[PDB]
Structure formats: C-alpha cells, structure tokens
Design a protein around this ligand. Structure first.
Ligand SMILES: [Ca+2]
Ligand SMILES: [Ca+2]
Ligand SMILES: [Ca+2]
Ligand SMILES: [Ca+2]
Lengths: 198, 199
C-alpha cells in the first residue's frame, strides 16, 4: 500500500488564529470545481464561496474538533436547491496504473448551530469523486448519513485492469456540494488516497 | 421494523426466455429506458444500442455463475464510443420519501465474459445505481465495486431522510446506469431490492 501525495490535503494552509474564523478564497493547492458557474471569482461572506475554516476548541458549529489538524475546507452555495453543484478539485501528479486498487477517503461534515440569527440546520448532500483525466472512475454520491455537527468518513474505491482505457492519465479528486437542500454549506477534511497492487 | 418497498419486475423475470443466452431488445415490462443522451434508439435491433432481458441459465457461455435471482437479468448495451453519454433503466415507484427513514437499495451488477466468433465481451463500461426522489438523485453508487469478468456483485446504496427533507412526499425512483466509460460496453443488473426502516 502506497500513499499518493495530495497538496493541502487537510486544508491546513492557511493557518487561522481565531476559532471559527474562515477564508472565502479557494484553498491553496485546490481549484474551485464550478460546472454551473455558481461560485464567483470575487467572493464575500454573502456570495457562494469556498475556503478553509478553523474548527478549534469551543467551536460553535460542531460537537467535535476538526477530523485532522486545525482546519476544514468548506463550500457554501447561496443559490436555491437544484441550481447545480460546486466544490473543490485537485489534479494529482500520479497517473492511473494497471492492476491497482485505489482507496480515497475524505471526512465530510454537517455544520450545526446558529450564526447571528441564521440556522445551519440541514445539509446539501455531498459527492466525493476519484478521476482519471476528465472521467469519474468512482464516486460516493451522498451515501453516508451525517448528523448535525458531526463528521463521517466517505470511502471511494476503484480497481483498474490491465487494459483500462484511462491508464497513464492523471488522477484527480473532486469534493462536491450537491445543493440538494438547505442549509447549503458543508465541510471536508483529511483527504487520503492510497494505491495497492491487486 | 424493516419494510420491503415493492418494485415491478424487480428481477427482470418478465418476459420468460426459453433458450439459454437468448435475450430481448425491448425495454423490460415495468421499466423505462433512462436515455439522457439519446444513445438508445426507440426501435432497436441486434446491431444498435439496446436494453432488455437475458436468460443466464445452465451452460451460459458468458458467465461463471447463474443469474443472481431467477432465470433472467436486465442488460444495457451501448454501441457508441466511450465518453458518448450514459443510458440504462429507470423505474418510478408508488412509494414516497418519508421522514426519519433509512433506505437501502441493493442491485446485483454483472460483467459479461467470453467471446463469440470475433465478438469480445472482455471489459466493462462502469455502472451507477441511483436512488431518486422526484428528479433528485438522493444517493448513488458510482462504480465503486470491482466486478470480475463473468461474475455479479451486489451494489448497496443508502440514504437517510430527515424530518424536514426538501423532497419528503415525492415518489421514490431507481436508475440502473451504464456509464459507457470503456469497452466491452454492456453490463447486466438483477435482483433489485429496496427496504425502508424508521431511524
Ligand atoms: Ca484539517
Ligand atoms: Ca447542518
Ligand atoms: Ca432475475
Ligand atoms: Ca466483460
């Protein structure tokens, strides 16, 4: 079993000093997955946005600390349910190899609580994708039940054969807010990808 | 407190097929053709993209086991090149999405094996199994299982509803999808089962 390198895999960059403070800019190492043009180039707290947030001691929005380190990565979509999807994408240096079992794990979080008169009750749905090139090899579309204020680990698996059409193509990861309901923000952390010969 | 949700022709046992490895090229009764990219024509032949039922019986040349359930499977074959789109089966149910309920959808997915006079069934196009409410995909297994040539494996899709779910009261649905991500570009499904349990 080999670990595949991912940049900023736990969204620990940038460092954030104040509990529950957050950025509204794409996390370093990641790009914004934006197929429905829901996230603008220039963001504020009020627009659809994504960024990192410090889930530290006494957090108002979770029953636990971050799955890993200080920070999580979050996506918030302001448009009404059904408007489309958005999230994070990262293309990796590793390529798809034959006769290899891939296992992608990501913790997914459901915010709880209240932020100045606003309820974070509800959850938009998530999808975790493993890519080769532009092809989604495997994905977990919203199978886990995630309680308010908790994180749960999503596992995505793909097994390549000797003749896979996508061999030699770059691996990628997408972490997607499905905007299927409100509150329509969610969190991700602790992205891990392993490869093991079959 | 688990309850079975009824599904029409859930094991593709209609129509009856007499001869092992025979198959139909029309949508199976109880089902519709999921066709978001118009890959499957309304009038099919043995030469076109198609779907139907197939008898996976004793002495089958395409599998190392029999059908997961009964005699028959449901198949979807796409003639277009990888990347052209997806297609499959859809069935909208009478049942509706209820609050505080755990839904579990199980479907067996098969990978055909073998050859026939120059035709090769080596390879697999990828699968997705979807649980719907209305037009929304609540949960799906996009191709997570490894399925060996000539075998079936069970896919499990789960969704848990809350008390204020946006889609409460909408009709449940199932889609079984050929992803057309590689060739051979056919695959089989069988033994569709959906249960609901209060949380
Ligand atoms: Ca982290
Ligand atoms: Ca929430
Ligand atoms: Ca059957
Ligand atoms: Ca095959």
């Amino acid at each position: 079993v080999v670990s595949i390198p991912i940049n900023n895999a736990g969204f620990e960059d940038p460092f954030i000093e104040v509990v529950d403070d957050y950025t509204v800019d794409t996390p370093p190492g990641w790009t914004t997955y934006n197929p429905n043009n829901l996230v603008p180039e220039k963001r504020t707290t009020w627009t659809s946005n994504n960024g990192v947030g410090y889930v530290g001691p006494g957090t108002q929005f979770y029953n636990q600390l971050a799955p890993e380190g200080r920070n999580i990565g979050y996506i918030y979509l302001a448009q009404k349910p059904g408007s489309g999807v958005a999230g994070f994408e990262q293309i990796l240096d590793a390529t798809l190899e034959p006769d290899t079992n891939y296992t992608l794990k990501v913790d997914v979080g459901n915010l709880a609580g209240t932020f100045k008169g606003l309820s974070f009750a509800g959850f938009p749905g998530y999808r975790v994708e493993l890519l080769a090139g532009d092809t989604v090899l495997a994905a977990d579309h919203n199978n886990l039940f995630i309680k308010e204020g908790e994180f749960k680990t999503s596992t995505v698996t793909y097994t390549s054969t000797a003749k896979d059409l996508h061999l030699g193509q770059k691996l990628g990861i997408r972490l997607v807010n499905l905007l299927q309901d409100k509150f329509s923000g969610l969190d991700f952390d602790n992205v891990r990808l392993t490869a093991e010969p079959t």
